[PDB]
Write an enzyme that holds these catalytic residues in place. Sequence first.
Site, PDB file in Angstrom:
ATOM      1  N   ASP A  42       1.662  10.858   2.668  1.00 59.41           N
ATOM      2  CA  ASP A  42       2.300   9.908   3.591  1.00 59.41           C
ATOM      3  C   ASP A  42       3.270  10.664   4.505  1.00 59.41           C
ATOM      4  OD1 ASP A  42       1.074   7.815   2.225  1.00 59.41           O
ATOM      5  OD2 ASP A  42       2.934   7.155   1.255  1.00 59.41           O
ATOM      6  N   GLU A  90      10.855   3.357   3.367  1.00 56.81           N
ATOM      7  CA  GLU A  90       9.788   4.344   3.384  1.00 56.81           C
ATOM      8  C   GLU A  90      10.317   5.760   3.547  1.00 56.81           C
ATOM      9  OE1 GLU A  90       6.866   3.956   2.459  1.00 56.81           O
ATOM     10  OE2 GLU A  90       6.346   1.847   2.736  1.00 56.81           O
ATOM     11  N   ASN A 145       0.754  11.541  -2.495  1.00 61.10           N
ATOM     12  CA  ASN A 145       0.249  10.461  -3.337  1.00 61.10           C
ATOM     13  C   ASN A 145      -0.564  11.028  -4.501  1.00 61.10           C
ATOM     14  OD1 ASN A 145       1.329   8.476  -1.483  1.00 61.10           O
ATOM     15  ND2 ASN A 145      -0.421   8.865  -0.127  1.00 61.10           N
ATOM     16  N   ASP A 177      -3.514  10.398  -5.423  1.00 63.78           N
ATOM     17  CA  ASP A 177      -4.919  10.634  -5.089  1.00 63.78           C
ATOM     18  C   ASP A 177      -5.129  11.911  -4.260  1.00 63.78           C
ATOM     19  OD1 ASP A 177      -4.039   9.852  -2.588  1.00 63.78           O
ATOM     20  OD2 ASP A 177      -5.514   8.262  -2.317  1.00 63.78           O
ATOM     21  N   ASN A 228      -0.408   7.100   5.777  1.00 65.93           N
ATOM     22  CA  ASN A 228      -1.223   7.802   4.782  1.00 65.93           C
ATOM     23  C   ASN A 228      -2.414   8.535   5.391  1.00 65.93           C
ATOM     24  OD1 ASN A 228      -2.219   6.603   1.428  1.00 65.93           O
ATOM     25  ND2 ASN A 228      -2.458   8.614   2.393  1.00 65.93           N
ATOM     26  N   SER A 271      -3.780  12.377  -1.220  1.00 68.80           N
ATOM     27  CA  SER A 271      -3.404  12.068   0.145  1.00 68.80           C
ATOM     28  C   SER A 271      -1.887  12.274   0.291  1.00 68.80           C
ATOM     29  CB  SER A 271      -3.810  10.639   0.504  1.00 68.80           C
ATOM     30  OG  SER A 271      -3.056   9.706  -0.248  1.00 68.80           O
TER      31      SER A 271
END
Length: 129
Positions: free
Chosen positions: A52, A35, A46, A48, A59, A50
């Site tokens: 992380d 990650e 991301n 969309d 998220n 959003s």
Amino acid sequence: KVFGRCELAAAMKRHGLDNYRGYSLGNWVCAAKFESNFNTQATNRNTDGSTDYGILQINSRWWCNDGRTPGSRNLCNIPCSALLSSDITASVNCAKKIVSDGNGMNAWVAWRNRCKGTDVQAWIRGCRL
Ligand SMILES: [Cl-]
Ligand SMILES: [Cl-]
Ligand SMILES: [Cl-]
Ligand SMILES: [Cl-]
Ligand SMILES: [Cl-]
Ligand SMILES: [Cl-]
Ligand SMILES: [Cl-]
Ligand code: NA
Ligand SMILES: [Rh+3]
């Protein structure tokens, strides 16, 4: 902060992740490796809109507030910036809620694609735990 492998394993263990919801410590270390490469300051946007955050790439769509993710929730009741701290407490506590959400560690796509089913114990090999 960029953790050492065994350093992070020890911190995760102290914070109660070893075998949390049945997931051995190596699963958590493996997830963090892919990650964030063990970097608490890791951020990734991301598609969309959003973002992380942190060692486990939590998220903003559901888990933390960053003020720029429309329609999202803040289920860990924390600013997303808290997830970038050198102190992993906020990341661990929020990870506990995520992994309890129904799908276990499959919530972390990188864990499913890169850690699940592999010899995850290798990630804590040699560590004084
Ligand atoms: Cl490593
Ligand atoms: Cl393990
Ligand atoms: Cl928001
Ligand atoms: Cl909320
Ligand atoms: Cl906030
Ligand atoms: Cl810590
Ligand atoms: Cl599970
Ligand atoms: Na949010
Ligand atoms: Rh600590």
